[PDB]
């Protein structure tokens, strides 16, 4: 079934010390997260660049890693029920907070952790180039050759287009119908590895280190080994849901060229352009498209998805 | 069905500033072109070199990019009807002309834009290496394994042999029959990714910036933001059709070695050599073979082709 | 009388080895050509640049020799009858072919050798600065001071504007009348050293190394000392004549500034601009203007011209 | 059917000038060779190294290209009948000799051109990685999945083990039976791309530049453009056949590691070792194994083979 998605967003210094701390702390955070039976996996992204749309963002490019002074991370964790995410944080607060605190010296912005429901998903399981033979064999054996997926390689060997949209209040349904039609047509593009639409349902105060006065002081005054009061979060997930409604259109591609011209199909192919125009008419903001590298992931979330 | 092909040809300075302007302007031109419902896609080529034919052109080689002071571009746009191309230019003149003008500082020759009908096509859809599993699965599911194409990777991950021919008046049919037989046999060569024969039907004056006196002065005197009178083109497409008849034999290959020895098959394999000799007997000019890299493309033109 | 003109065109690597082979082979080719009594001289050009027309060809300039990776040559040979050119090639094939073959290692494109009739000529004999005193003295002695020509120095000490035009079918007469009027007025410009209009009547297959299948294989397989069958040319000169009709407007100037502003007179002097506009209205292609340096020449062709 | 094989062997200076002359002359020679209807293709090899057999040849290694002062070439040409090879040389002597003469400045040893019959062949057609999808599709379509070959990439993208053997007179049959059994078992090794056994039937004097006194003087005294008397070869092909009998065991592999451990299977796998021991017992000389790179080839010889 469709899991809920929590996305922890942050901006840190782009220097080796930052990536060294990803390697030490990241695995720990994920392992603590896996303590909860509602946890169904994760997909961690590093932003490598921005889609320039010609020169609409002429100062940007798809790979800005060599020039950029900061690095932005977007950590997806997948949950049977979004409430599981909230429960996980509170049950494992002592570990989580102290782990995330060691990121402090590198933090510029964040963490900010919106929660999303998936209202549309066309996402295959990941496979390495070594696996396709067995996958093909098995699917033919069981008479389901139509279930043979594209090869979507895990661990930094494909790229993601992360497309931000905010929609005019009252136009949500028009956006949702048009985006689904758009993605259903978009899957014909070469190198297309899947897509899903995320609809924000709220924000996790605890995951965003957003407490009341008490917790705020505890955060600011912390030596690193004392938890803020996890009950000092002053709002529930839904209370923080944004209006205008926010969506993420998440599309995966074989490489940055397939991404560039693939996403471009909604602009270059007249038939698809007409359909995608219905999406554009509903927007307050966007589309703004970040290029992401899914470096670290628990691929089994797609197994939960496709069962 | 078979679309018509417009090929915008130009020669520019081989320097970074030239490629920077491709990235800013190219996408825009393509997007304006897609405004017309007759537009069915594009395939943009950079010439990387010339086929030396041993040492017949001993100063040349397949990859001359590192030494060359100029770059030649050949932009294919595909059209349901060639008249659509002409209509598109005129309907969107304000945008098109001002966009193509920003190429000015880099121009050495061109633009020159002949129009072609396709009289023969054996061209598959493009696919990335990640797609073949799903393509195989789908074709077997629908009982059409014979429709499984070779893997013809988009976005600069294959090469094109662009073979110029002009034919002795009265020998057109002999050329056309012999070239089709040749290409039907040539498809056995390893790394063969498809072929098509383009027959020139005329030239687009408006696409070639070839106006009467009035438009010419407007072009030369332009600050960049004023259009020449698009009605000052003094000839129709067919009026500019060349005699001797011109053809392009367009053949795609996995790599430059497969191209070199593949094209060479018409010279090295006695059986095919005899057939290809019938082509040679009809020529006023050629064969002259440019090596092209199809870097930017709207792959969906092949979908229109193969329906 | 007016001779016919054969122009051998080729593009070679711009490196010392190329010019070294000009000095060894060129003289030989010219000496073999002089075996035929119909040969009345030659004028060999190196292209040094392209007229930018402001920034219409902004990447170009009049002298591109220092930056260019290639060099283009245009070798005019002059003939009492164009048939003499064809006869010369065949009578001296063994020498000619083997000589032109040694250019192989430097060839990028060509050779291509169109033939032209001169439909208008205002071209003086060449003289060195040392000669004018005797020329003046002689002309006054014989009572013909009006026959004292401008000083048109031979051997790379002046420059040529080589203006390509292709004309809309049915507009040839309008072009020819308007171009003659244009050149008759243009001769008032400072530094004007003469002009002529060349009208293509066909192409020499043998001079262009364009044979049937048999000759083509012989060319490609040649060790350098075996002639292709000179009777394997499959078309006559006129059979290759182009439609749209092609013309060369050949204008000579004291220097590149006199050329730039001189040619510019058809754009800058209202009276002449009106007349030249009639030329512009007839064009399919052009004007495209190459800057040439006439380095090596047999000046006596002008003696034949002006008798 | 099984073609006959001529192998032109030579040793030249390992310097750029040598490879430059391969690119100019090689294509010509192969094109002249293709004049004969008995010509069914070629496979040209550069020796990159020697199989060291542990340290039996401790001074050698599989890739010696960076250190070696010479380069050895082995050019296979394939023929319907070995007599076709002899006829081809004589019919095209003037071209062939003059072409092969330009190699002179680089020659250290050779040319030497033994002729061979194929007494065993397990060799697939070549295919590029882009082709396998269509090959798979076609073979399943025609109900022959057993005829789907390994992917044996052409043009320098695989390697060859060239194993020299000479056999004790009277032991030929034992050698032939044991080598076939060996190769039938060897095909199980990973990366195995095919094998064949060549049995020498003679030597081509004309291909080896081995004439009588008259031809020898003509060779030594040649300016480069005069043929030795091709009728001055003093022996027929079979008259030069060697005793002890010579064989080449030609095995192709995905890469040098697969080659090393693959060939090693006859030494490391007890079962296969016992069988291969029967080969060893028959030998006067060998096995001596050269590592070859098949850079230039006419892949269609395998099409003739497998029909
Ligand atoms: Fe969280
Ligand atoms: Fe156009
Ligand atoms: Fe000539
Ligand atoms: Fe031979
Ligand atoms: Hg993690
Ligand atoms: Hg943090
Ligand atoms: Hg484009
Ligand atoms: Hg332009
Ligand atoms: Hg000369
Ligand atoms: Hg030449
Ligand atoms: Hg060859
Ligand atoms: Hg030789």
């Amino acid at each position: 079934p469709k899991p809920y998605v929590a996305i922890n967003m942050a901006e840190l210094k782009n220097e080796p010390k930052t990536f060294e701390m990803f390697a030490s702390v990241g695995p720990k955070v994920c392992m603590v997260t896996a303590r909860h039976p509602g946890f169904v996996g994760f997909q961690n992204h590093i932003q490598i660049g921005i889609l320039p749309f010609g020169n609409r963002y002429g100062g940007a490019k798809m790979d800005m890693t060599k020039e950029s002074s900061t690095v932005r991370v977007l950590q997806y964790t997948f949950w049977k029920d979004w409430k599981d995410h909230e429960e996980m944080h509170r049950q494992n607060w002592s570990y989580l907070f102290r782990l995330c605190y060691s990121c402090a010296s590198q933090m510029i912005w964040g963490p900010w952790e919106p929660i999303y429901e998936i209202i549309y998903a066309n996402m295959p399981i990941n496979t390495e180039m070594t696996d396709f033979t067995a996958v093909v064999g098995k699917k033919f054996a069981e008479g389901k050759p139509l279930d043979i997926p594209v090869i979507s390689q895990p661990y930094g060997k494909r790229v993601v287009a992360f497309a931000e949209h905010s929609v005019i209040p009252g136009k949500e349904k028009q956006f949702e119908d048009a985006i689904v039609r758009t993605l259903e047509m978009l899957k014909k593009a070469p190198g297309f590895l899947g897509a899903m639409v995320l609809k924000e349902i709220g924000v996790s105060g605890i995951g965003s280190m957003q407490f009341g006065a008490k917790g705020f002081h505890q955060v600011l005054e912390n030596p690193g080994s004392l938890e803020p009061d996890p009950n000092n979060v002053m709002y529930s997930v839904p209370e923080a849901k944004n209006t205008p409604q926010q969506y993420i259109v998440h599309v995966e591609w074989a490489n940055t060229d397939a991404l560039m011209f693939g996403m471009g199909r909604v602009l270059l192919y007249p038939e698809l352009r007409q359909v995608h125009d219905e999406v554009l008419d509903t927007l307050v903001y966007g589309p703004y498209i970040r290029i992401l590298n899914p470096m670290m992931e628990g691929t089994f979330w797609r197994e939960y998805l496709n069962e």
Side-chain angles (χ1 to χ4, degrees), chain A residues 93-125:
Chain A
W93 188 230
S94 313
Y95 276 79
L96 280 182
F97 172 78
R98 297 188 198 193
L99 291 170
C100 276
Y101 165 93
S102 50
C103 301
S105 64
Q106 315 300 110
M107 293 280 301
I108 293 174
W109 172 88
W112 179 246
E113 190 176 41
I115 312 292
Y116 301 83
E117 58 181 332
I118 305 179
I119 65 172
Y120 170 89
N122 178 22
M123 298 281 284
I125 63 169

Side-chain angles (χ1 to χ4, degrees), chain A residues 20-75:
Chain A
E20 291 165 8
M21 87 98 182
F22 283 166
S24 300
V25 171
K28 300 181 164 175
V29 174
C30 283
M31 284 186 287
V32 165
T33 302
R35 290 159 120 139
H36 193 287
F39 177 70
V40 303
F42 67 103
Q43 184 166 313
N44 292 348
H45 305 83
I46 303 294
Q47 176 179 302
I48 61 174
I50 298 298
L51 194 65
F53 279 108
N55 71 338
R56 168 59 181 90
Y57 304 107
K61 51 187 190 174
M62 286 192 293
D63 192 329
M64 296 169 72
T65 57
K66 300 166 186 293
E67 321 133 58
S68 186
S69 55
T70 70
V71 54
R72 174 179 280 243
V73 297
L74 303 90
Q75 297 161 184

